[PDB]
Amino acid sequence: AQYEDGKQYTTLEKPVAGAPQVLEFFSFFCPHCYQFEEVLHISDNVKKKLPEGVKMTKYHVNFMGGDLGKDLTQAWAVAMALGVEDKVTVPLFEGVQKTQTIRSASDIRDVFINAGIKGEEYDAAWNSFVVKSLVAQQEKAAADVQLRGVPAMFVNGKYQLNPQGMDTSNMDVFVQQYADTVKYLSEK
């Protein structure tokens, strides 16, 4: 067939109950993640094709970058709590990987301040239990899909995107195929 298990996607031997419809894992330390988000715009292209009533969820992971990697997961939790993901995603990727001006938790916070988030607002979120639960949720989700690497994407807690089985010719057919596959899986 056109879409095949073991080709564009694989199937979780242990399906995750109550999982987000479309779940992406990434790290701001992850070079392929920078490519996925900032050059290929995979999230964006996926969302443009998603069925009505299907939401995309994006979680950060701890295992790259040590203390700073964890700080970034906690800051991503702050972004989710405040609803400012689309204001901080580009400057966080650029701060960590392009300018490499993000070296500490304070440097992360600066990105939020510069993006117009009030200091009091950031600090209250950063120290909140709502954010601690969001950090825990992200960690739990990684465990549930038995995550081994990033970037990664899972659909309805049952299927894992397999970019290794897609075309790597033109970046654009690749992106289209990835996005088309997510849509196929969402309706499966």
**Into how many domains does the chain fold?**
1
The coordinates were experimentally obtained by X-ray
Question: Which position has the token pair 């088309």?
Answer: 180
Residue 102: which CATH number? 3.40.30.10
Exposure string (b/e) for 59-84, b if CB count within 10 Å is 16 or more?
A: bbbbbbbeebbbbbbbbbbbbbbbeb
Give the residue numbers spanning the domain of 142. Answer: 1-188
Q: Which residues pair with 23 in a beta bridge?
A: 57, 154
DSSP labels, the chain: --S-BTTTEEE-SSPPTT--SEEEEE-TT-HHHHIIIIIS-HHHHHHTTPPTT--EEEEE-SSSSHHHHHHHHHHHHHHHHHT-HHHHHHHHHIIIIIS----SHHHHHHHHHHTT--HHHHHHHHT-HHHHHHHHHHHHHHHHTT--SSSEEEETTTEEE-GGGS--SSHHHHHHHHHHHHHHHHT-
How far is Cα 59 from Cα 23, in angstroms, rounded to an integer? 7
Indicate the resolution in Å: 1.6
How far is Cα 76 from Cα 60, in angstroms, rounded to an integer? 7
Sign of CA dihedral 163, 165, 171, 174: negative
How far is Cα 138 from Cα 25, in angstroms, rounded to an integer? 9
